[PDB]
RNA sequence: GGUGGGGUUCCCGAGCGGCCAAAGGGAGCAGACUCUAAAUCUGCCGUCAUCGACUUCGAAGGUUCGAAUCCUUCCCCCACCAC
RNA sequence: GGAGGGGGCUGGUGACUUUCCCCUCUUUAAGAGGGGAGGAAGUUCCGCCCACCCCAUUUAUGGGCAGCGUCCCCUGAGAAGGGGCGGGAGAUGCAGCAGAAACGACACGGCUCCGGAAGAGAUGACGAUGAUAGUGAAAGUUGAGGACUUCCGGAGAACCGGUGAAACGGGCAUCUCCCCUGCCCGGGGUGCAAGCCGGUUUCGGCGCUUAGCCGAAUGUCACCGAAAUUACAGAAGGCGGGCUAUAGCCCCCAUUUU
């Protein structure tokens, strides 16, 4: 099963997504299926039907789990998902 | 208490598990790249966590290219048992061709008949 | 300004690219032992605390089938120098 | 138009004080003039000027550097960043598990021959987990009143390895030599807190500066400009290369966007 606690090393292909803050302003009101996962960017179909390439450090995630909606910075979703599964501790401080 | 029941591993699996699911999922539309980044995620996870593969994803992938092989479309399976047992998976896409030799199964169904050969 | 080096468990300290391989010692807890206590021995030894399994080898990136270890960068800690 | 990356530059003038410093100068001792930290001074990875000690005096032998731009590999929003430079031989390693087998080839099983045992002549054994059966036998076409078989042990021409990242065969990394091309000839070791002098423990002087301190000087304000004392950040003998961290403007590239 996939938790909300080891959300920072699950797989996020294929799993809903929509985001809901940014620093683009037209990056918010997205919702959509992970396709593709590099260091800091997802690629994610939206339901419309466009591709959009997401970077992550700058907005925070809410991605839709079974019944779960877990809301994750893309900080904290730094690294590639094999370095990420391998190991990476990220700290944040919102300061 | 025990907060994580599951470890490394075990999420590696899991990893391992849903990123197949996903590649035969996403083949059979298609987007044969696409499923073709999915085995190559699935394989850099598999030499990285020093994990072996499942005996049910195990049989399904090239090892040359990495084209996730659907039996009919890009693969031909045919089972060839005159000279030794064997059980051909052929690539379409490149032109890898792989086996899965069955002999020393047919050496313990051998034995078996023996010995129901000697206690008759 | 300069040379030869070191950072690994609470503290002193080893470690071939490979199964917590992590030598360990002292410390804490528990057992054993004793009228009590010291000393000796046994297991946990960071966690679940019975076997066993996972994390940490100053930090990051990269190579690799796989990093305490190999490469690069960022650091700190030593020793001694004015004549 | 908005986060970000790379490259370029970082001072000048005027006033105050020798009581911020150094140098020069005249003069009823005090004034006047000039100059005063940067792209990295940091990191110490290096080389050269300068010194001492040893061998040697050699471009005979031999040593050192380079194969750049280009290309390859790896990671990023694919602009950008990092590493490398030709070929051969020898040695080591690719743990554990798995696989016949982990770096040169092989022993092993399917294939051929021989010896032993068991069943059998319109019977019976075997066979869709594939039968007499063929092909350069990796592979592919074949698919049954098909049909004379099976095992063990030994020896051999050709083909083949369910495993693993990587295999009857080609790779990877390290080390050492010889096969090249061009340039240069003293070879090593320590380093200015080296080394030298008055002194002979300890001190002062040279190295030392178109800034040159050492108990580590380079001050304050305004303004043109817009490159400005604002971020990283400070000399200590000097010069050149590379790395690290970013203030202001200029230029270039990318995502969202319209
Ligand atoms: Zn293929």
């Not at chain 1, 919702?31 to 996962?37: A, R, T």
């Not at chain 2, 699996?13 to 499923?35: C, F, H, P, T, V």
């Amino acid at each position: 099963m996939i938790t909300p606690h080891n959300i920072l090393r699950h797989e996020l292909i294929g799993l809903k997504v929509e985001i809901v803050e940014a620093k683009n302003k037209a990056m918010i009101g997205i919702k959509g299926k992970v396709v593709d996962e590099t260091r800091n960017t997802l690629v994610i179909e939206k339901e419309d039907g466009r591709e959009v390439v997401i970077p992550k450090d700058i907005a925070v995630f809410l991605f839709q789990l079974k019944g779960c909606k877990v809301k994750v910075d893309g900080r904290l979703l730094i690294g590639r998902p094999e370095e990420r599964l391998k190991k990476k501790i990220k700290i944040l401080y919102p300061y | 208490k025990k907060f994580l029941e599951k470890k490394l591993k075990k999420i590696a699996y899991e990893r391992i598990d849903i990123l197949m699911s996903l590649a035969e999922e996403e083949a059979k539309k298609g987007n044969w790249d696409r499923a073709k980044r999915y085995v190559y995620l699935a394989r850099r996870i598999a030499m990285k966590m020093r994990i072996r593969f499942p005996k049910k994803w195990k049989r399904r992938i090239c090892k040359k290219c990495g084209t996730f092989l659907l039996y009919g479309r890009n693969a031909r399976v045919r089972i060839k048992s005159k000279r030794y047992p064997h059980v051909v998976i052929t690539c379409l896409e490149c032109g890898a061709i792989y086996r899965i030799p069955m002999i020393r199964e047919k050496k313990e169904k051998r034995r078996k008949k023996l010995e129901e050969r000697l206690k008759a």
